[PDB]
């Protein structure tokens, strides 16, 4: 689109029995390809673990 790319993301996630869209009806997100984000993880609070 000039200096910006167009990505149409139609991902879906399943509820109890039905499909739902990850994104709302009409939204847009100005983002960065190298924007750093944390995929950090918690601790397993299980007795056997």
């Amino acid at each position: 689109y000039g200096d910006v790319a167009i990505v149409v993301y139609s991902g879906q996630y399943v509820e109890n029995g039905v499909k739902k869209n990850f994104l709302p009806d009409n939204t847009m997100v100005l983002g960065n390809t190298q924007a750093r984000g944390l995929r950090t993880y918690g601790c397993i609070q299980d007795a056997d673990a």
Binding site: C43, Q45, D46, A47
Partner: protein, 49 residues
């Protein structure tokens, strides 16, 4: 004791001795206690920060 039987009469016959029993059967003790697996998340009073 012996008391004084005279040498003309047969005298009495003593019951010899003995006889006493008892029972002390059961007993028990069992201190169960919990490890609390979710207690290890926070810091103990030991283990310097």
């Amino acid at each position: 004791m012996a008391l004084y039987v005279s040498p003309i009469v047969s005298g009495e016959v003593i019951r010899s001795r003995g006889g006493s029993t008892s029972e002390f059967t059961p007993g028990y003790v069992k201190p169960k206690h919990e490890v609390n697996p979710q207690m290890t998340l926070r810091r103990l009073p030991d283990e310097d920060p």
